[PDB]
Amino acid sequence: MKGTLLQEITENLLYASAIHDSAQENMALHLENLKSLKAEYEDAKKLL
Amino acid sequence: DEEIVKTPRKLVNYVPLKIFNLGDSFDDTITTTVAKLQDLKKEILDSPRSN
Known part of the structure; x- marks a missing residue:
């Protein structure tokens, strides 16, 4: 796999997949925080 | 009344002033x-x- 240059391809693929999974979890967390900010700023708009 | 007669006054003695006529209190620039x-x-x- 190393000589045929297939090991580096799999290494890059797995690194990208791990980055994707971590980014998806952080994306869910960002969605939660964004909805919390939406509620807070809606309360601010009621105050306005 | 004051002294014995009316106080002396200048022949014109306008002195308009009257910059403010009552009101005052709350400022207008802040509002x-x-x-x-x-x-x-x-x-x-x-x-x-x-x-």
Whole structure:
């Protein structure tokens, strides 16, 4: 796999997949925080 | 009354002054900024919020 240059391809693929999974979890967390900010700023708009 | 007769006065002695006629108290510039912020926040209310 190393000589045929297939090991580096799999290494890059797995690194990208791990980055994707971590980014998806952080994306869910960002969605939660964004909805919390939406509620807070809606309360601010009621105050306005 | 004052002294024995009317006090002497200058032949013109206008002295208009009267810069302020009652009122005073609350300043107008602070509430002017308030009204500017009011129209600004109304314009913001025109812009979409949420959704």
